[PDB]
């Protein structure tokens, strides 16, 4: 039933604004003063409970914290017409940023703020009766996202233990870049995330920009579009908890089905009927077309090509008016294709889910209206190429200690760079070894 | 996150007066000091540069220091001069005499305690202190000597903060004073030890900007100081307004300086274009980036084509797409790839801010860290060695009390700075 | 032609937001005329679901 | 200090730095003895 959302730093808060806008509009949470003055669904139902708790007077409040080290973005949420929702304790803001230094966030500044966050999360976790995971949004390229995200996941992992943690993470794009020190922060972040996360969802901004250029008709996209796409993906994954359906899928089923070995937990995500309003009235959108669509690389939200690897598991979530027989026919057609390949030790490669609630349309939004959608998360060896490119860029910079004095000044030993780089190298070797066929001479 | 300003010498006080006019205009503060703005976004970060006096009023967080009150009386007589707190005006009783050693050692130590007391008093009242901002010329006398004295004292008292200086530096042809090489060399020696980040402007570059780009028939010092106030107010813009990708002085420093001595930067501001001509320019990100790299718009006499970029930063003001910024910076890096140092995979940082400067639809300020600055230091060292070998004017400084070994140390340290720039310029992967 | 200047959040997510609904207001504006609203709720004290029948 | 303005930061009971002194969320507790087992087997008359 319940899930708690933790938003960290700039990307995580900006994606959070779009997420909570969407979940409010889907449930029907409105200003108390603003009477609907119009026809509504009018059915008193428990579905809010996943995200809201009631005070008993009937006010709704959301299960989220907003964490930042610079004030400006959180002070911006405290000043809008959305101030009335969050409990003011939930909106936590520090004094000064971690200045793109992982060492500054982890050692110097986040260490002061971290105990308030754990006390707030405990106060949230005490007001639950069937908590089944945390959703975390952050980017590993910046200083506070890396350092405080690592520190907070470490503390959560000791205190809460076995409970599942699913991350939505914005990684540094392979040639678009925003800051020089991105490789160092991403390597050091990835070292902590490897040990302390149950499922990791991979995002690249260059892929979502390419997808918005090719499929949607936007010449000049901005971050609000990407965050609305992310919000749609999260709504699709959490819909299985909130509405009636033919084949439900609890969040623990993702972890059991997608992760074969405890280190192999980094997953790709894609979404099918990303379509514009002008195209939407020229075409029918049956199940088999969108099932064929989700496997094309033009549909993916991370810049990797799966034709250079092998699938290990796929989880397909269908929402809207779909019938299981059409899903079975689609999956059998996918299985026939020769350019889609599974490792020979994984014969039953697919899990299906079918939910009746169609995706919501947001008044200012850019997506079309569609009766059905499918969302995919899949585990594939192609991901090894992203790490190899980050490690090569790290090696280029680290051969001359190009920036290390900032990190050493803020409290970190030089040895820690080599340890993290060797651990990510071992993760690369794991992906090389796991994908090697266990063929036996006879 | 509040900045404290210090204005020193004639150049510093005039540029500061124009700067505080520009900042007061941007936040809608009347010349009486009353807030008269029309949106909360103006008010909600006013604390960054102003302190609040009782019932409405705002006072600007600046210290004015000079050795003869002529300039101070001129700024006090100016149109916004009344805004400044009377107790914040510090002056002596005899001039700097254009001599660094007198300004640094004799009248400096006499006045310095009252300025440090006021600066400490102002800093410790803040709930969290960001860096200091200082404007001065390096070629002068009280500017160089007392500015670097004060810089050293503030670095002793606040070593964990950031230290930022803005500095005007001598043209190779247009000297205003004969003894410029000594004062410049000693001041650069002091700054390279004490400072965290230092910005440099050539009056020659501003003259060429005005004549070629703006085609002004009769430019005045008010225009040059407006250009400087424009760049200065642009650097702090992300500190004090919302945006899609916030940035900060410390974040700029961490991304711009690869090694702690390499902290001298060039500045530019893009939507510069002369009055009258039907061409508008600046209506899109390609136009700003193309103008941004045009040497006509760069604030130093050295040209980038003789050096290589270690790092660069661009701060954009206005409502714009991140794709146009990102793809333009990628295209510029790919097309001009020989001018970017190859062992760094991406040399440009971008930042985007929602609130443009008044009267421009969009603007960008550019900060560049380029090795061609080494030619300037070589030039200063040449003129210094020519004068010093012949003892050309040294008796004034020695009569104040300096040992010649300070001059030989400062020359050696500057020569080592030139060597370090040259080695990193010609480094290779191998 | 630059009198109106929004920021990106207010332009995309909360465009219909008037200047009277933000935290900062002048000290000479009336407060009784503004309707009361200090939290978010599904219903506006609506009678269809809140009343318990007997 | 960390909160700002307070004389001193209040001590915290929920969490701790030391892993052997922190308080786990999922307390692993005991079932009552009544609700287990089989109970008496009782026969009707056919």
């Amino acid at each position: 039933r319940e899930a708690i959302c933790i938003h960290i730093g700039q990307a995580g808060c900006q994606v959070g604004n779009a997420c909570w806008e969407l979940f409010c509009l889907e449930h029907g949470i409105q200003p108390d003063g603003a009477m609907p003055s119009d026809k509504t669904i009018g059915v008193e139902d428990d579905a809010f409970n996943t995200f809201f708790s009631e005070t008993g007077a009937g006010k709704h409040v959301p299960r989220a914290v907003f964490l930042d080290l610079e004030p400006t973005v959180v002070d911006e949420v405290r000043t809008g017409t959305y101030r009335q929702l969050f409990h003011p304790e939930q909106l936590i803001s520090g004094k000064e940023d971690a200045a793109n230094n992982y060492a500054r966030g982890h050692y110097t500044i986040g260490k002061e703020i971290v105990d308030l966050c754990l006390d707030r999360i405990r106060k949230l976790a005490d007001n639950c009766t069937g908590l089944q995971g945390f959703l975390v949004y952050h980017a590993v390229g910046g200083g506070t996202g890396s350092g405080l995200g690592a520190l907070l996941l470490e503390r959560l992992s000791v205190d809460y233990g076995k409970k599942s943690k699913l991350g939505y993470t914005v990684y540094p794009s392979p040639q678009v870049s925003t800051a020089v020190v991105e490789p160092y922060n991403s390597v050091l972040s990835t070292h902590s995330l490897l040990e302390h996360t149950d499922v990791a969802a991979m995002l690249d901004n260059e892929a979502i920009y390419d997808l918005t250029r090719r499929n949607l008709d936007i010449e000049r996209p901005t971050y609000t579009n990407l965050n609305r796409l992310i919000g749609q993906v999260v709504s699709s994954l959490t819909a299985s908890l909130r509405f009636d359906g033919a084949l439900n899928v609890d969040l623990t089923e993702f972890q059991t089905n997608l992760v074969p070995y405890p280190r192999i937990h980094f997953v790709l995500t894609s979404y099918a009927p990303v379509i514009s309003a002008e195209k939407a009235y020229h075409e029918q959108l049956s199940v088999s077309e969108i099932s064929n669509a989700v496997f094309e690389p033009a549909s993916m939200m991370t810049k990797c090509d799966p034709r250079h690897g092998k699938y290990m598991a796929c989880c397909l979530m269908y929402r809207g008016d779909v019938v299981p027989k059409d899903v079975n026919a689609a999956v059998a057609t996918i299985k026939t294709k020769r350019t889609i390949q599974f490792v020979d030790w994984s014969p039953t490669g697919f899990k299906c889910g079918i939910n009746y609630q169609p995706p919501t349309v947001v008044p200012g939004g850019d997506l079309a209206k569609v009766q059905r959608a499918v969302c995919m998360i899949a585990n594939s060896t192609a991901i090894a190429e992203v790490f190899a490119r980050i490690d090569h860029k790290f090696d280029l910079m680290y051969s001359k200690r190009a920036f290390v004095h900032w990190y050493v000044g803020e409290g970190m030993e030089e040895g820690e760079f080599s340890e993290a780089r060797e651990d990510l190298a071992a993760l690369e070797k794991d992906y090389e070894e796991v994908g090697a066929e266990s063929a036996d001479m006879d | 996150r509040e900045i404290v300003c210090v204005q020193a010498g004639q150049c510093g006080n005039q540029i500061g007066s124009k700067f505080w006019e520009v900042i007061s205009d941007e936040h809608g503060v009347d010349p009486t000091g009353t807030y008269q703005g029309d949106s909360d976004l103006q008010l909600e970060r006013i604390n960054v540069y102003f302190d609040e006096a009782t019932g409405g009023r705002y006072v600007p967080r600046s210290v004015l220091i000079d050795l003869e009150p002529g300039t101070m009386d001129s700024v006090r007589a100016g149109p916004y001069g009344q805004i400044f707190r009377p107790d914040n005006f510090i002056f002596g009783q005899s001039g700097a005499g254009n001599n660094w050693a007198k300004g640094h050692y004799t009248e400096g130590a006499e006045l310095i305690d009252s300025v440090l007391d006021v600066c400490c008093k102002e800093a410790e009242s803040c709930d969290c202190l960001q860096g200091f901002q200082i404007c001065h010329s390096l070629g002068g006398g009280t500017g160089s000597g007392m500015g670097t004295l004060l810089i050293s004292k503030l670095r002793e008292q606040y070593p964990d903060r950031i230290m930022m200086t803005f500095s005007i530096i001598p043209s190779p042809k247009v000297s205003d004073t004969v003894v410029e090489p000594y004062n410049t060399t000693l001041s650069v020696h002091q700054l390279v030890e004490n400072s965290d980040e230092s910005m440099c402007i050539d009056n020659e570059a501003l003259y060429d900007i005005c004549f070629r780009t703006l085609k002004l028939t009769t430019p005045t010092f008010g225009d040059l100081n407006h250009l400087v106030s424009a760049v200065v107010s642009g650097v702090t813009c992300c500190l004090r307004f919302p945006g899609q990708l916030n940035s900060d002085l410390r974040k700029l420093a961490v991304n711009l300086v690869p090694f702690p001595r390499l902290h001298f930067f060039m500045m530019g501001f893009a939507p510069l274009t002369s009055r009258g001509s039907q061409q508008y320019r600046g209506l899109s990100v390609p136009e700003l980036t193309q103008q941004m790299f045009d040497a006509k718009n760069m604030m130093q006499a050295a040209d980038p084509r003789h050096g290589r970029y270690l790092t660069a930063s661009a701060l954009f003001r206005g409502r714009m797409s991140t794709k146009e910024v990102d793809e333009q910076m990628l295209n510029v890096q790919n097309k001009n790839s020989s001018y970017f140092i190859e062992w760094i995979p991406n040399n440009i940082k971008s930042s985007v801010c929602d609130i443009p400067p008044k009267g421009l639809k969009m603007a960008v300020t550019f900060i560049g860290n380029n090795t061609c600055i080494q030619e300037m230091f070589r030039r200063v060292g040449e003129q210094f060695t020519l004068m010093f070998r012949r003892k050309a004017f040294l008796h004034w400084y020695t009569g104040e009390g300096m040992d010649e070994m300070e001059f030989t140390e400062a020359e050696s340290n500057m020569n080592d700075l030139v060597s370090e720039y040259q080695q990193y310029q010609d480094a290779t992967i191998e | 032609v630059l009198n109106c200047r929004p920021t990106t959040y207010r332009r995309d997510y909360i465009p219909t937001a008037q200047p009277n609904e933000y935290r900062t207001l002048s000290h000479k504006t009336n407060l009784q005329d503004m309707p009361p609203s200090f939290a978010y709720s599904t219903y506006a004290l609506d009678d269809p679901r809140r009343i318990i029948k007997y | 200090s960390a909160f700002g303005g307070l004389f001193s930061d209040p001590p915290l009971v929920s969490t701790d730095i030391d892993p052997k002194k922190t308080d786990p969320y999922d307390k692993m507790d005991t079932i009552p003895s009544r609700y287990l087992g089989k109970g008496m087997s009782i026969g009707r008359c056919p």
């Binding site: 405290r78 101030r83 009335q84 969050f86 003011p88 308030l116 | 400490c120 709930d127 | 935290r23 000290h27 | -």
Partner: peptide
């Protein structure tokens, strides 16, 4: 100086803003 930590006197601090803030209306 009385053999202490230099003849410098440190001025006090004026305000200390906290971490969590209220969302009630604020006036100019």
């Amino acid at each position: 100086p009385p053999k202490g930590a230099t003849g410098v006197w440190k001025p006090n601090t004026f305000e200390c803003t906290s971490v969590v803030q209220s969302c009630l209306r604020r006036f100019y």
